[PDB]
């Protein structure tokens, strides 16, 4: 039980880290393709700096 609970925390931590990764951390799964399929730019990327 302790092993599994710690495993749950570790999974949550990796998922949290992964959301902040790339390219400008966002809902990257579809958003990058959705950004180029229209003549647009992701807002979070405009506010990168």
């Amino acid at each position: 039980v302790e092993r599994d609970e710690v495993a749950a925390q570790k999974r949550e931590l990796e998922k949290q880290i992964e959301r902040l990764s790339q390219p400008s951390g966002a809902e990257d799964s579809r958003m990058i393709a959705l950004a180029e399929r229209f003549g647009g730019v992701l807002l979070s990327e405009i506010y990168d700096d």
């Binding site: 390219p23 990058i32 393709a33 180029e36």
Partner: protein, 50 residues
């Protein structure tokens, strides 16, 4: 994958070229003996362009 990576690389390259071009203008018409200007020339290697 593929195209999107190329686009981010291209935009990064473009932004660096533009910033350099802005820095470059501040150094126009500087007189040092017979030298009259200075530049930072930026180019893309072929083996990577292809």
């Amino acid at each position: 994958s593929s195209k999107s990576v190329a686009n981010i690389i291209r935009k990064t390259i473009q932004r660096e070229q533009n910033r350099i071009r802005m820095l470059n203008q501040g150094l126009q018409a500087v007189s040092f003996g017979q030298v009259r200007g200075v530049r930072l020339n930026v180019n893309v290697r072929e083996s990577h362009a292809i």
